[PDB]
Amino acid sequence: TPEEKLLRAIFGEKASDVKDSSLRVPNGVSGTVIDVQVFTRDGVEKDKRALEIEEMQLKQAKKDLSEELQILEAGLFSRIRAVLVAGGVEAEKLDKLPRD
Amino acid sequence: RVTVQDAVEKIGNRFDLVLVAARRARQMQVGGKDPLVPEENDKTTVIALREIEEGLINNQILDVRERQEQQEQEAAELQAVTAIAEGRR
Amino acid sequence: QDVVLGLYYMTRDCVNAKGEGMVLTGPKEAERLYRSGLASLHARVKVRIT
Amino acid sequence: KPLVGTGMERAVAVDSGVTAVAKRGGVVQYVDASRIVIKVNEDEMYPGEAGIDIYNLTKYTRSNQNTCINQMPCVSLGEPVERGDVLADGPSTDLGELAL
Amino acid sequence: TEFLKPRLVDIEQVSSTHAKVTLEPLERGFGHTLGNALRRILLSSMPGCAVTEVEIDGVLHEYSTKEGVQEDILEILLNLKGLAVRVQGKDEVILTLNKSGIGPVTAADITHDGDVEIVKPQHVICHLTDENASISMRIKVQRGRGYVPASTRLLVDACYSPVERIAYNVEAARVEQRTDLDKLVIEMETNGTIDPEEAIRRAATILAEQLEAFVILLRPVDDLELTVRSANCLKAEAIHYIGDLVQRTEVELLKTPNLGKKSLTEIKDVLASRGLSLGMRLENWPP
Amino acid sequence: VTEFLKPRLVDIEQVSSTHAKVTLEPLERGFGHTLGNALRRILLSSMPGCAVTEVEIDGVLHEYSTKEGVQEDILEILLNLKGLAVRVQGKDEVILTLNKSGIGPVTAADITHDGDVEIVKPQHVICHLTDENASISMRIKVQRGRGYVPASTRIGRLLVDACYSPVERIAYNVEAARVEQRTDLDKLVIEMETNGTIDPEEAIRRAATILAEQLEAFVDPEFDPILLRPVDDLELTVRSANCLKAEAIHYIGDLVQRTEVELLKTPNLGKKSLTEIKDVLASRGLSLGMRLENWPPA
Amino acid sequence: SVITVGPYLRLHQCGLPKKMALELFKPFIYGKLELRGLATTIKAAKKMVEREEAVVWDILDEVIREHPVLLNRAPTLHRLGIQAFEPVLIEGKAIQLHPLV
Amino acid sequence: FGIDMNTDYTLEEVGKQFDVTRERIRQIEAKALRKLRHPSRSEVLRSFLD
């Protein structure tokens, strides 16, 4: 409207092609953001959004493998040790050579 | 709550009092605070009701002031309005 | 509810062995004496109230 | 835990899978907010052919009614636990007893 | 640390000897505190003159009734309790009351003593019926504290305190941001011997005089949750903490071997997200 | 006209480090409950004390996070920090540093010994590090205040509910005092159970002080607002903002008064910065060399 | 909203939460802020009130002065199922109701 | 701006209407806009954006 035209002209904001549709926090609510999940159509222009989270999940997963292999190693070798000692006792000898 | 029984006592049938007080309050918001009895507190509705309580307003008296207001509008223009009427024959 | 429980409690008959024979000097002085001491769960006391 | 119970508050917290329990007798190897590692065979050497078990704990998960479901470890490092012992308490549970 | 102290006052004079003064701002829990403290002082520790004994001619026991007097001795003592007297500087004074005739015998008929001041002379003490009736009595007035009944040890219940009734209301107060403020509304009922306000300042005086003898820059970059690449680049540039990063400028960072504009923009975003920025001066790095 | 007997602290029976019994020797009958209630009411809510208000734990962003190598989650840790009893010399804000690596409990005794700060209960558990490669490094902010001020009463920094009041429980007894003189005298025995941050005597004198101070007698648009906004509201570059602040330009009103000539004469402002400033000012209907004549009103 | 007892209330009064009152009386508040010099225009008043800027509250007190609200509870079996009360601004999210009613 | 006649007349049209050159009309348009935008009287018209 002409009044709005004048207002914009006075303040020089220029009419934007796009309209604000952002998701906002509802009334009476508030707090701490503890997680975000993003899902993008396959082969979409994935940006920093789907890359940072991706890499983070990869690091968490990899650590989830390292810890399980740590428990598995210190879980099976500590059992094969008591088996190896019985008969062929090597106290000061076994705790030297590599685990593999 | 403020002397409501007395206010209704001043004008029977309750309802009618509600209509009247409403009209008076509309008078307060329409033109000027004016009026009388004068506590100047608790907005237009209660100013009108307190006015009615002291029988300051009253329906007939309000109607009379309105007719006099019609006479006041007659006052001024008058000969000029009649001039606007006489020019158009 | 509670209001009743209150009123009934403040106006209940009692042996009044403690707060017996009290001249009130009026409802005001009576209240003063009531808040003060020696009056509990009402008393058998004459009231000077006009 | 309620100071006045009926004695059923343990069985409720037990049968609902919120609380994490030990499968077999063993000893606690590791304790974390995130996970609890238990080394089996301490009592009656039940486990065979590789020994140990790792319980990942649910942490700050969201329920259907928007309440936060999180487990807290109820054990300490090196603690001896038997079969069916409470390891981590779920939401609204205290030492294996129901806390509403 | 300072507390909210009284501001703006109001006094609602219900009558000539009954007033309601209120303090507008108070902290929560002080309404009942000052209210009960003051009620306990006022109802027992106020100083005032009061009738304690009476010597009427011809009268022996309170159960007796006098010839020519409408009301019985009990009612007469009951009236004598309400005798409002202000004495100059004494703790005991004897008033003489001689009266003959028909009609009401008021406090104005009491023999005018120089020291003694009678607040309400129109206060009715008796009622003489016949014209041959007459009363002659000696009213003993003593100074004391609180309500001391005659049943202590003719005798009359002594109401030394000038105040008949005390009440208080806590009511949540308005005012600026605090919301949890109260305002103490004290309802006072005195006899007019002493002013309400000065009675309050006197209770406060007694109370006070009783209390006389008792008066992020050092956080690692890893906390920012940057990309692995950005973090490793920063660590490679000897930037291990937030403080190290906030000192660098965009230009200088772009001059480093491993940090591009995407990464720099990321850094600006994550820093802005925590109220921080690049090129921040802290002057004195480090203590 | 009988002069009154005025109360004085006469006894202190320290049952323990945090439990005491303070008694007043002279009192008139009926005064026991008055001071008893007044003092209990002041003590239980109006006492000033130090309390943890903010905490900065490394690696942790939000309090709902859980840390690798720590038994309890961050919430439990903060909840533990609420109970950190600290006595600070003469300050209204102090930063405590806590660095700890190893296995076992991380108590208040592991907090870096600061000269001013006194730790009442060093054996107070804050954490439990499980594995020997685990370590925590946190910054605990301790402030002085009054009453209960929740964290909800408003950076990657956590907030903790503040429990400022040093007093947990108060009790009092009226008990008839001895002394042949007057005979009708009482003695107020206040049994206090505090957190050990503050001594009984000064607490009593402080409650009485507050009470006395409460009893302090009984007596009786023109111009554009945008000009008073800080320069940060212009959202300039860090360099331009710092330069302007260095030139005593802290608000938009200060900036709009300056001219191009004057600004270019400053030691740190180049053509780029000026272009930026003119651009951001023009973007909001403002400019340089603006006359507002009357700087400032009040 | 949920109702709680209000013992301090007069029979002609009710406890009304600040936020609720702020929302309900919004156009009145804008109008009053335009009449007095508190805001240049209705839009400015809105922008100001949304922020919850101070003095908006005192203005709200000026708005509900002598004004009445209707309180209603289902089921409405008789005409006393809806009654009028003078609103008193209160902290908290609960409506406070007079015990006699 | 079309407040009059419901049409946004060109600078040349307005110039022709006032018997002046387009440069003149652009000049007075510019000083008018300048007056409007100025900090004085800017209030009210301002903030109406969001």
Tab-separated table of C-alpha atoms in Angstrom, chain H:
chain	number	residue	atom	x	y	z
H	1	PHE	CA	3.281	7.038	-4.164
H	2	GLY	CA	-0.276	7.004	-5.463
H	3	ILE	CA	-1.941	8.476	-2.380
H	4	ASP	CA	-3.680	10.797	-4.876
H	5	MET	CA	-5.591	9.491	-7.952
H	6	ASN	CA	-4.534	5.903	-7.125
H	7	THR	CA	-1.692	5.990	-9.668
H	8	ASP	CA	2.071	6.263	-9.166
H	9	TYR	CA	2.812	9.221	-11.457
H	10	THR	CA	6.302	9.396	-12.991
H	11	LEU	CA	8.811	12.107	-12.048
H	12	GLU	CA	8.252	13.631	-15.492
H	13	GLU	CA	4.473	13.577	-14.987
H	14	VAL	CA	4.656	15.365	-11.634
H	15	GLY	CA	7.259	17.740	-13.054
H	16	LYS	CA	4.948	18.538	-15.955
H	17	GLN	CA	2.098	19.032	-13.472
H	18	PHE	CA	4.078	21.648	-11.516
H	19	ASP	CA	5.605	23.257	-14.650
H	20	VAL	CA	9.109	22.357	-13.451
H	21	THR	CA	11.957	20.118	-14.669
H	22	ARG	CA	12.388	16.515	-13.511
H	23	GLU	CA	15.630	17.413	-11.723
H	24	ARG	CA	13.750	19.959	-9.614
H	25	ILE	CA	11.028	17.453	-8.684
H	26	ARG	CA	13.650	14.845	-7.824
H	27	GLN	CA	15.371	17.482	-5.680
H	28	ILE	CA	12.271	18.452	-3.683
H	29	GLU	CA	11.353	14.762	-3.417
H	30	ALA	CA	14.814	14.157	-1.965
H	31	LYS	CA	14.627	17.011	0.544
H	32	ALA	CA	11.115	15.922	1.550
H	33	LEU	CA	12.265	12.351	2.160
H	34	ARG	CA	15.256	13.845	3.969
H	35	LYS	CA	12.969	15.839	6.266
H	36	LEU	CA	10.833	12.769	6.966
H	37	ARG	CA	13.706	10.373	7.724
H	38	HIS	CA	15.379	12.798	10.164
H	39	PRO	CA	15.582	11.770	13.841
H	40	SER	CA	13.150	14.541	14.816
H	41	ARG	CA	9.564	13.458	13.992
H	42	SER	CA	10.965	10.034	12.949
H	43	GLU	CA	9.195	8.543	15.964
H	44	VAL	CA	5.768	7.026	15.194
H	45	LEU	CA	6.545	6.416	11.530
H	46	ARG	CA	9.526	4.412	12.773
H	47	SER	CA	9.250	1.036	14.542
H	48	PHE	CA	6.166	0.341	12.400
H	49	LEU	CA	8.345	-2.146	10.486
H	50	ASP	CA	9.199	-4.970	12.998
